[PDB]
Design a protein around this ligand. Sequence first.
Ligand SMILES: [Zn+2]
Ligand SMILES: [Zn+2]
Lengths: 320, 136, 141
Amino acid sequence: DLIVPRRPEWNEGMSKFQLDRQEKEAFLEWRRKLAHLQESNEDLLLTPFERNIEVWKQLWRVVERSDLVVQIVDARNPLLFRSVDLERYVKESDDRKANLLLVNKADLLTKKQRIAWAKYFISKNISFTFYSAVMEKVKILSIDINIGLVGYPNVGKSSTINSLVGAKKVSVSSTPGKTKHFQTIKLSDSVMLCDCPGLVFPNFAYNKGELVCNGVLPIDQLRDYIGPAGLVAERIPKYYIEAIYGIHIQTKSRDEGGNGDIPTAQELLVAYARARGYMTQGYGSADEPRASRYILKDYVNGKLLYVNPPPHLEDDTPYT
Amino acid sequence: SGNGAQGTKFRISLGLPVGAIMNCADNSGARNLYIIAVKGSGSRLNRLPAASLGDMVMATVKKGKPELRKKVMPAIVVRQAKSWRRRDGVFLYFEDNAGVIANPKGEMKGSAITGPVGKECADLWPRVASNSGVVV
Amino acid sequence: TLLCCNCGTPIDGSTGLVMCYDCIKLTVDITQGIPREANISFCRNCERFLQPPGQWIRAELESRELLAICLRRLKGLTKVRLVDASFIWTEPHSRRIRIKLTVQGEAMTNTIIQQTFEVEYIVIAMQCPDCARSYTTNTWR
RNA sequence: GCAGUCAAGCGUUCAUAGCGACAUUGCUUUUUGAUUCUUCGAUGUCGGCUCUUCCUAUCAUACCGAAGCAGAAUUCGGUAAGCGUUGGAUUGUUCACCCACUAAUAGGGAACGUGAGCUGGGUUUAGACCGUCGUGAGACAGGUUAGUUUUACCCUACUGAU
RNA sequence: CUCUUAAGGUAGCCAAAUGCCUCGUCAUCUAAUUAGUGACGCGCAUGAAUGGAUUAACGAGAUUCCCACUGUCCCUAUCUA
Ligand SMILES: [Zn+2]
Ligand SMILES: [Zn+2]
């Protein structure tokens, strides 16, 4: 509801001292507002975001230097990362606005679900573009003033830059901790493209009982390891798991109702690392915090595919 | 040594030193216990400490129910395989070494001890006597 | 179909439990053995704090490694387990760090309960001595 | 490094039940440094393992005394070296750091005890790789990996035996 | 726009046999890890036939863990030439 920091005006005059003072102070008011929001929702669930001055200053600089932004969000969960106060924040100059949001990494959605997603992306009147980087569309092509390329990391937003120009301007990584200190691109010299650093937006749901271990948290640096384990367990059923991996895991050894069918990942990580041979220091046990990393970095790549439905609670959109 | 123990035990032959992985006898969810130390053990240079029947040890779960492992917890040795002498003359030994997870007061964590339990262990703790079906 | 056995009144379930919720709230503690106020040093020039044996960690104010250095401060938080030590806002000038901690302590028998408790971290002023001897003209290498 | 000397203050107005200023007297070789006195026709060079003995500047045990010592638990001090002072993870490590038991895991010395006692992980020849430096041969107190550890039968000492 | 007489470390890779600080930071394995692995990178002092990255098979090469096994050890004893 209230998730963005807001910089009202520049006023063009002078005095960089108070131009820095009013921006620092202004930024701090947003932090106090967020703490008040935190008392409200139980006591525990905090939205994922950042609250330092400089990387928000680097967006506060570029929003009016572009005066139009375009978005790069992933197609496997595009409902959550459409932050409410960013299409509302390209509104405040009373000029050409309405950002025309784009969703990328959309190769993974087939014909029976791209149209079902376009139904949601049209019906509630949200700006939308489908691209594997108004109803008459299947997917736009690589053929089809400053542009603000805005995206939270590991969405392939630096692989989008290596697919429209061929210049190799910014450095992508596997971990999402690289993009910072923006780099503008000159191409088709009457038009300019600017860059934005990696800015995750505050989303008020699913933060500690989360689903956000797909694009946000460090997979190589985690210390809960059972949340994403059961998250990988409950979707992508056992037959597709053994189809991809080839390993024999289970035929319901424990017959009690704690597991039943669709097995949880305390007999999955041990069944993966008993085949990969990863053992502990002292006893021969398959270490689940070693198997969990190779499960998570294989799932979030796109090998173990999963996409949620359009935001109505459905049964199953993917069919393996 | 007297950490919730009832009385004083005779010197049973020291069956299993530190590093011994004995079985787990109760239904706590553990399956084996890795002995790291024995409570009330004397210090001699190079003599690594050993646990007899009925001793309270500090141990670590090495297999089963991941709520239980990666932490140090007290156990009580209820079966040993080293043959020891009872003062009424009989020598005896079990077929496996096996212990039971307890709190520092001596109260158990499980609810039933599968398999036999030595008399010298069942007598020294009134909670191991309450949860054991077969005694010797 | 039981009774609390500490206060006596409430009937509680057979899911595996202990005396009443107010009784475990007021009588039973699992957060004992921690200091609720803690001091840490700093330098106003290089902005470097430390645990008093060790090297400066080169983090800044409102960071992530503040959780690491406060966990590495000797409290009872390491052995009582840990989850969700997320940060709480404080005025920058007021020179305090406020962390909420949630441990899952073990009760009288097998029952694990949640906890909400708080520890304030107050920062004192220093000068980073290893930096003060660098300005002092002792022997050179 | 430790011991005393005046002890601003702090310890709830409680100069000493404890701690802490300025400066101040002094000790031990158990360490940093300074010379170059002894060995350059060689005194085998780190650590660990093993084993014996000594010191007290006492960690525990014994007996006392004094406290914001009610009991319980602590603190500090006096005699006191008789008797003990561990098992492990990582590192060659001395050192350090955790884990755990314990009454306690005190500090040291005896050619920085101890290689014809051992080991050879480290260092310290010759082989080779990297990084930096040099035009180059080559250098590095930087990293890494391979690299022969000799003799007692003599005198004494000690252990036993005539 | 330039500054030295040319250019200004590209693709890659990493506390690597190359990282002084350094037992770097985070996670993980362990009861405990200056070790091992994964990840990060203004990298004293990585880097493209002074070859860079990856690699099945092979190795009396260096390194960490597990299973089995054991006098290596607890803690020594006995026997034979
Ligand atoms: Zn009650
Ligand atoms: Zn400083």
